[PDB]
A = this chain, B = another copy of it.
Amino acid sequence: GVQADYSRAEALAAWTRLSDEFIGNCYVSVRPRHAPAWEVVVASAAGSLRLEAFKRAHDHDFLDRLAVAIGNWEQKAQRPDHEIAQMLDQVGDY
């Protein structure tokens, strides 16, 4: 198998300016059934909550969809387009 690489999850966690609440709302929308519910992630996060959520999204192959959701909300908050595109470039495909 492939060893888990969380560098892309770490990059997204170090990029987004959304609140925990907006990140949670994105997660609830994009979460596939085989990924843990948001409350499970919240209860599990020893350190950074957003990092925990993005690690789970990596584990369950939906970090690309979660990154797109985060980018869409940042775009509505007038985050500059090239910064959204930089994030999307860094996070990649799942």
Q: Of B32, B68, B69, B72, which is within 8 A of A68 by CB?
A: B32
Residues of B within 8 A of A32 (CB): 68
* Interface hit among A5-13, A23-31, A40-48, A49-57: A23-31
A76 within 8 A of B: yes
A contacts with B: majority SS: helix
Copies of this chain in the oligomer: 2
CB distance from A20 to the nearest CB of B (A): 15
CA of A73 to CA of B37, assembled, Å = 11
Which residues of B lie under 8 Å from residue A65 when comparing CB positions?
30, 65
User: In the complex, how many angstroms separate the beta carbon of A87 from the nearest chain B beta carbon?
Assistant: 13
What CA separation (Å) do A28 and B25 show in the bound complex?
Answer: 11
